[PDB]
């Protein structure tokens, strides 16, 4: 399980000295000198915070168990030393939040469609085969790379965007809030100065749905409306969401997410 890098089928026996630290992104960007592959490495120090190390080990436990899920960041191997644990994760491009910051505007629906089917299937995978509820769905946990892949981040994968009943299917509400934010470039609770004020607007105000003057398809507006159901007893589970016309459309439609991602990253900071 340890002392081996598995980068695309091939397994390599290696140690931490076989990796060149290319800087920080504690998550390091490191290069495998034997092959030239550039990977992400998380360093968990033995003397580190017990609360932080507990979350890292619990998240790693789910990641190692989720090798058969294509919509979850995978582990390439581990290196255990006397003072550190190095966790090799696949190097993703950037999170959806930084994509929103670099875009300085709305994200196209065709990108959010491929994003929706990837995150729902990831959440559905965590609950059915592992009984895991993410309990923290947000654009910062949605990772996209230069190859068009969309995967769930490993941070907090073992369990502002909080559902009404949380203040089971509460991650459905957080997904709907994330979709509205990315589709409009505006967080629907951006003028709230405190966390408690956000919770009040979630319960008191009507759910913030997609605008009808941005060319959004009826399937997109319907999927978001279903995700943002106030009553959790009437909010659809993942089995019902996977049968939505919005999901079925982007399960098969060829969307060039890779080229769109490269153009957004090519935009200057």
List domains and CATH numbers for the chain: 1-92 (no CATH), 93-269 (1.10.510.10)
Look up tokens 């993942």; give the residue: 238
With a CB cutoff of 8 Å and minimum separation 6, the contacts of 194 are none
Q: Annotated binding residue at 38? A: no
Resolution of this entry in Å? 2.3
CB 61 within 8 A of CB 160: no
Those residues whose C-beta lies under 8 Å from the C-beta of residue 224, and which sit 6 or more positions away, are 176, 179, 180, 183, 209, 210
Alpha-carbon distance of 155 to 21, in angstroms, equals 21
Residue whose C-alpha is closest to residue 159's, from 170, 150, 149, 144: 170
Geometric angle at alpha carbon 194, from 188 and 196, rounded to 5°: 90
Catalytic option among 18, 84, 136, 145: 136
- 136 belongs to the catalytic site: yes
SS3 (DSSP) at 70: coil
Q: Are 162 and 170 in contact (CB under 8 A)?
A: yes
Establish whether 89 is an annotated binding residue.
no
> Helix (H, G, I), strand (E, B), or coil: what is residue 113?
helix
204 marked as part of a ligand binding site: no
DSSP-based three-state secondary structure for 12: strand
Closest to 2 (Cα-Cα) out of 112, 110, 76, 93: 76
CA-CA distances (angstroms) from residue 261 to 102, 141, 149, 165, 258? Answer: 11, 17, 10, 35, 5
Q: Is 100 annotated as a binding residue?
A: no
Q: Which technique?
A: X-ray
Strands, E, within the chain: which ranges? 4-7, 10-13, 19-24, 27-32, 38-45, 75-80, 84-89, 94-95, 142-144, 150-152
Tokens of 79: 């290196």
The conformational region for residue 149 under phi > 0 = left, psi -120 to 50 = alpha, else beta, is beta
């Amino acid at each position: 399980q340890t002392g081996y890098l598995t980068i695309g089928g091939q397994r390599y026996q290696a140690e931490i000295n076989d990796l060149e630290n290319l800087g920080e992104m504690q998550v390091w960007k490191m290069r495998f000198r034997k092959t030239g592959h550039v990977i992400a490495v998380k360093q968990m120090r033995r003397s580190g915070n017990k609360e932080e190390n507990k979350r890292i080990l619990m998240d790693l436990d789910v990641v190692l168990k989720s090798h058969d899920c294509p919509y979850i960041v995978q582990c390439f191997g581990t290196f255990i030393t006397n003072t550190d644990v190095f966790i090799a994760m696949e190097l993703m491009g950037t999170c959806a939040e930084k994509l929103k910051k670099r875009m300085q505007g709305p994200i196209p629906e065709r990108i959010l469609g491929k994003m929706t089917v990837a995150i729902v299937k990831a959440l559905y995978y965590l609950k059915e085969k592992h009984g895991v509820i993410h309990r923290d769905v947000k654009p910062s946990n949605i990772l996209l790379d230069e190859r068009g892949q969309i995967k769930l981040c490993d941070f907090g994968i073992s369990g502002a965007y909080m559902a009404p009943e949380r203040i089971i299917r509460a991650d459905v509400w957080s997904l709907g809030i994330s979709l509205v934010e990315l589709a409009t470039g505006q967080f629907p609770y951006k003028n709230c100065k405190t966390d408690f004020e956000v919770l009040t607007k979630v319960l008191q105000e009507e759910p913030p749905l997609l605008p009808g003057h941005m060319g959004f398809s009826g399937d997109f507006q319907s999927f978001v409306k279903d995700c943002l159901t106030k009553d959790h007893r009437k909010r659809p589970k993942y089995n019902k969401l996977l049968e939505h016309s919005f999901i079925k459309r982007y399960e098969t439609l060829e969307v060039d997410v890779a080229s769109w991602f490269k153009d957004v990253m090519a935009k200057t900071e």
